Structure 1
Amino acid sequence: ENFPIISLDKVNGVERAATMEMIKDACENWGFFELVNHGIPREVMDTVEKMTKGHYKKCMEQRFKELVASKALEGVQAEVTDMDWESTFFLKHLPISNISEVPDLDEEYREVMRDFAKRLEKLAEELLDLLCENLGLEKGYLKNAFYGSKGPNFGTKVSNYPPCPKPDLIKGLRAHTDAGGIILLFQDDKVSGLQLLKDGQWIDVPPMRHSIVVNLGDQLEVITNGKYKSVMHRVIAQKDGARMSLASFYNPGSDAVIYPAPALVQVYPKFVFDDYMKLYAGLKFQAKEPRFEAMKAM
């Protein structure tokens, strides 16, 4: 019954019970919701957008000069059509902020991303408390569970990309659930180009200006014992939609022990988060002894 667009300002007013029930429905039946009025000004978001696209334009002009020169060595003229327009870089925020160390950024850009990261962290931890309330758990339970020793892993994937040549090329393309905790996507434009899978069929995430698309990953499903499931999805670059994405991942800390909350109890396993990501990466079957056991299980 339509995608959950949720006005987050309504959670400190008279329409709170409706808004929290809307979040509850989203968490249980969609695994995805779109936030508006979320305590991050348009001032801040447009500043992030303007400067990211500025940095992107520098990288593309630099890339073309290098392409023209490298192609010229082969006795070949580089065209603009030979461009790899894709550019992606990651920024660590927690536990240690890696914005200082990332190459080729303005200082004014670095400051705004430190500010932007601080604001999202509060939003993420606010949302986790709203989930804690809907689930019937104490405030900061999910923040606590995500902490481990050092603290939770938090970071932003900043990517700029062209549109797809034709949509039919993305026909038999593989989808996924996010392995992490909670994910917050900020984009330019209205159109995200993001689809999710509900009851066998693709639904587009509706376009909204100045919105944050939130979704739940595999860890929240383990902690909620299957109640809040991580849903299948895929992001596709639309012809006249978004061409810039800022996916911010708030996952548990490396050494954090993840398990279903005792109260919320067919049964999801107990494990350390780094082991889950080591299974995901495929490092846990480099020795032969693991492999024989896994083949015995299958």
Structure 2
Amino acid sequence: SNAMEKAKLMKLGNGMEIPSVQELAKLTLAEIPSRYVCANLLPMGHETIPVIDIENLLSPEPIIGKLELDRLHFACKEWGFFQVVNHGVDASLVDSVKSEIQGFFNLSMDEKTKYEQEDGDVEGFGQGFIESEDQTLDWADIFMMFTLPLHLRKPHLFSKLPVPLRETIESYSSEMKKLSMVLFNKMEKALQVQAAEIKGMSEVFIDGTQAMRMNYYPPCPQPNLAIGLTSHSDFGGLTILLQINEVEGLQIKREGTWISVKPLPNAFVVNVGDILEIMTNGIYHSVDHRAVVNSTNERLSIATFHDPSLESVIGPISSLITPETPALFKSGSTYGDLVEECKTRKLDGKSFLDSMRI
């Protein structure tokens, strides 16, 4: 890289665009710029996340189906995270998702940023804008966009994607949505929610929103000072993650320790979000997780998020409120209002979930 590129990447004021870490990584710096150093710790945990087989889950043989339903129910209660295998998503499609996204991140910055973002429109390539000097930046580049419903797709964003990536993403969206609905429907059965009689789970997600985050984590020279994706719990319904290459990075919090997730070949990693925990009246758990970086290999992933529609009324499903499981969370806000409230929230204090507790 040339000296002007270096200055553009490193001499950053508040209000400037967060720079590309894939570009920063080419500078091969001895120490990472100060903004990537995490300022404010749990130990590492061979206990691994459960595996759920979708063929078993959908088996026409009731004993097979019931066993897998017990496994799903267990994983959602006790782990909040599970791998899915025999998931029905064609191997060729998965290969194309991997190759086209690898292809995409290997394009020039000019080619990755052809979409003209509207003021306040944060979709496409980019982590956003620098907020303050004490803001910590993730060691990661991102491409984020809404994928369902169709009218939430930014048409000019979609038109500026390479054609094979766009077509593959469109197919992947459909398969991810189908898979999410298989899982929502089975979670509803595991919870004994009679969707015909009462306001259940699946009806909230069937016409809900879907979004994708494509993530590129370059190698980092000081991987014990930086983070790929800061510790968080997912806000919405069900997340389905594909790890694109064989580089480990995803870690989940279990009993005050960090546990590595090594995705299986031909597996997706699925987790419960905060809104899903609420809807289940705390029976299913949304778990803290993070992505770490390393000094030798880039890591890639794509996460597909399945959330309520913006006007879905959120609360614990009524048949899950019982004398043995009393109502833990408030009811009655729309999903869109919860999203907006969480953006402000309270500077100091508690998690979104704890803020919603009765």
Q: Shorter chain as normaliser: what TM range?
A: 0.7 to 0.9
Which residue does 1:41 correspond to in 2? 90
1:279 partner amino acid: E
- Quick check: 1:142 aligned with 2:201? yes
Q: String of CA shifts for 1:77-100, please: whole Å, max 9, x gaps.
A: xxxxxxx99432222221225264
Task: Summarize the alignment of residues 91-106 of structure 1 with structure 2, pairs less than 5 Å apart.
Answer: 91-95=145-149, 96=151, 98=153, 100-102=155-157, 104-106=160-162
Q: State the distance in 2 between where 1:231 and 1:57 align.
A: 32
Task: Give TM-score scaled by structure 1 length.
Answer: 0.79
Aligned equivalent of 2:338, options 254, 273, 276: 276
Which residue does 1:236 correspond to in 2? 292
* Structure (1 or 2) with the greater helix fraction: 1
Report the CA distance shift for 1:259/1:62 in structure 2 as closer, same or farther (over 3 A).
Answer: closer
- Quick check: 1:179 aligned with 2:232? no
- Quick check: 1:5 aligned with 2:51? yes
Q: State the distance in 2 between where 1:208 and 1:241 align.
A: 19
- Quick check: 1:59 aligned with 2:115? no
Task: Summarize the alignment of residues 1-298 of structure 1 with structure 2, pairs less than 5 Å apart.
Answer: 2-11=48-57, 12=59, 13=61, 15-60=64-109, 86-95=140-149, 96=151, 98=153, 100-102=155-157, 104-138=160-194, 141-146=200-205, 151-170=207-226, 175-239=231-295, 243-265=299-321, 266-270=327-331, 271-282=333-344
Long gaps (5+) in structure 1 = 64-83, 286-298
Look up the SS of the partner of 1:225 in the other structure: coil
Q: State the distance in 2 between where 1:85 and 1:233 align.
A: 16
Long gaps (5+) in structure 2 = 1-46, 113-137, 322-326, 347-358
Task: Give TM-score scaled by structure 2 length.
Answer: 0.66
Asked if structure 2 preserves the Cα contact closer than 8 Å seen for 1:3 and 1:206, the reply is no
Q: State the distance in 2 between where 1:205 and 1:251 align.
A: 23
Aligned-residue CA RMSD (Å): 2.6
Report the CA distance shift for 1:226/1:28 in structure 2 as closer, same or farther (over 3 A).
Answer: same
2:146 partner amino acid: K
Work out the percentage of aligned pairs sharing the same amino acid: 30
Report the CA distance shift for 1:181/1:241 in structure 2 as closer, same or farther (over 3 A).
Answer: farther
Which one is further off, 217-226 or 203-212?
203-212
Q: State the distance in 1 between where 2:297 and 2:241 align.
A: 15
Q: State the distance in 1 between where 2:92 and 2:52 align.
A: 21
Residue 8 of structure 1: how far off its partner (Å): 1.6
Report the CA distance shift for 1:6/1:137 in structure 2 as closer, same or farther (over 3 A).
Answer: same
Asked if structure 2 preserves the Cα contact closer than 8 Å seen for 1:32 and 1:214, the reply is yes
1:27 partner amino acid: C
Q: String of CA shifts for 1:189-213, please: whole Å, max 9, x gaps.
A: 2344111111111111133122111
- The number of residues matched between the two structures is 260
